[PDB]
Symmetry: none
């Protein structure tokens, strides 16, 4: 809802979410929840939606563009989008004022690329490779990451993209209602599988 573009990064602020995106690689740098005090729940390893071509991370050919609907005094009102252009790869992050801890990654390529996925867990013990979904849980911050990748047990740790593809990313507290709003169709199977993580 509030966009602050710095010389080193772009910051998107809502009432409960604080996103930090870079300018050169199109990565999610940092994510904070603010529902119970400013809490640094995600930080960039090599997993913030890097676009890997054949085995090397790609950088953008131009500065990212910031757009959205409902430009209020403070940036936008209901939608913010950030466009990253790698030439033959376009990547758009979309954040809506739904206060659901859910953002979108609409991505398009000419040749197939690999998009690393964010992990909030300390170790692989609290990560789940589920059908069409990647789950990552941090028991310290109680933070959940649910990425709908639509690869149906073929996921190998990176999003294989070729052509148009939208990814839905949940990143926030373990609040069951918010997961139902983010993934209404698969909610039942999802929660039933998420029980198996320590939690």
């Amino acid at each position: 809802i509030k966009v602050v573009r710095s010389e080193k990064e772009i910051v998107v602020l809502t009432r409960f979410e604080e996103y930090h995106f870079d300018l050169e690689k199109g990565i999610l740098k940092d994510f904070y929840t603010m529902v119970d005090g400013r809490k640094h729940v995600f930080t960039y390893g090599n997993d913030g939606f890097d676009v890997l071509d054949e085995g090397t991370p790609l950088t953008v050919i131009e500065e990212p563009i910031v757009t959205g609907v409902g430009k209020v005094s403070e940036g936008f009102s209901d939608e913010v989008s950030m466009v990253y252009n790698y030439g033959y790869v376009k990547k758009i992050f979309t954040i809506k004022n739904n206060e659901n801890y859910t953002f979108f990654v609409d991505i398009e390529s000419s040749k197939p690329v690999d998009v690393t996925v964010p992990r909030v867990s300390v170790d692989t013990s609290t990560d789940r490779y589920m059908e069409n979904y990647f789950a990552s849980f941090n028991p310290k911050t109680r933070t959940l990451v649910l990425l709908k990748h639509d690869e149906g047990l073929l996921f190998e740790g990176t999003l294989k993209v070729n052509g148009q593809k939208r990814f839905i990313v949940f990143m926030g507290p373990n609040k069951r209602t918010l997961i139902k709003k983010a993934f209404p169709e698969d909610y039942d199977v999802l929660i039933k599988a998420l029980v198996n993580i320590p939690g």
Copy 2:
């Protein structure tokens, strides 16, 4: 936000707007504002977005579909859409929870068709045919209709549709900020033009 589908019409209800759509012709039956008590500000004459093919109105080949995002206990939370299928014409009404008195008419055709435009004014005196915009004002109810038709002074009282086109329709009180939120770029010229209507 709240959808009530009876056997004779579909009713969309937000905190300030009350829409009534029919089931056979894809028309806006009635529109109420609820900001200063339930006020019947629009009613169907022959102008509720009737689809006129050659010179005769069309009816749908199937019952309309209701979709949207954020399926809550009471219908949807953030967006409602209604799909009307005339066979070679598809017409979709979209209402978002922006509380802006603004809805969208996404329309598509295989042959050129005509879409009648709503008028809230008792007479033509308080109607304006402006660049890319039709305005209609009812001084009794203080109700403004602003339709962005993108026909550029060539508008003749009916929307000419051929292929894909989206219409943005503001319908509600004469409130500066809401018009700016609806049409940010043309706002200056629009309102400087709306001065000429009684008001």
Copy 3:
């Protein structure tokens, strides 16, 4: 919008255009604009889309077919098409009711042929061979022809046809909005490049 077949030629008539096509050679014989009174702006030299096998013009093997959508009392309402069948070459003119002085020439051949391109200029002085586009301008009549040949500066005065190709032909007044509508992807490059002609 109106078609008149006269056992010697086919005439197509919209509100601003009057095309005269022959029946034996599939050529554009004459073109009239009517926005400022009936003005004879094109007359067939040797360039009304003649199909040349070597330098040998071809004749159709059958009489042309006239088709279209929305058959109104006067011919057609939104689309007229004329099919010329040279046996091993098909050539279809299409005139849509866009009121944009823009028609289409869809062409398909079995062997490489050459199609002449209409000129409106008195001399080669006011012609331009641009990237993917032929431009002819007549300073007296104020008529501009823009042909999208998509041959990228390899154009030598005739369309090289082998296989399927669509040509977009603008023939009318130097109106920037109409150029923007006809060629929406390249209009900036085109409008800037046309400054070099007298204009």
Copy 4:
């Protein structure tokens, strides 16, 4: 994904597919699936996309060309294409790394030709001529061929080519997800129709 040109045949090898093409006639010589060990499921009878001009088959006028995108250490990473030029007929096989047992045959002729269609069945018993599709099934190898010929029940056993046409060919295991992925518009009609084959 790996191309081996043996000066006598061209072999294209993916994770689950092995195609054997010749060099003189542009035919499919042999096809192996590998998902359950190397299983020889197609051998050329007189049905490996032979171009029959009217009575006799055609040979290419020049050696085929191998092209593709993402040229990795082993041929190409994601697309391979073989161009066969018969002078007045061009035939391009395309194999994408979609792991869908689905390849494409883009074809363009100057005069009407016939292209034979591969069969995996021992007899005509397990074959079906369906709306826009040819179906061949082998009950011992569990291999299904679905060719989208788009000739709508006018198909007579050979592809009628006269211009530009694209054929989508599925060749592989009877797997509904894959058929859905290759033919997403007709998958329900197709899959229901296939029940009539033994299976």
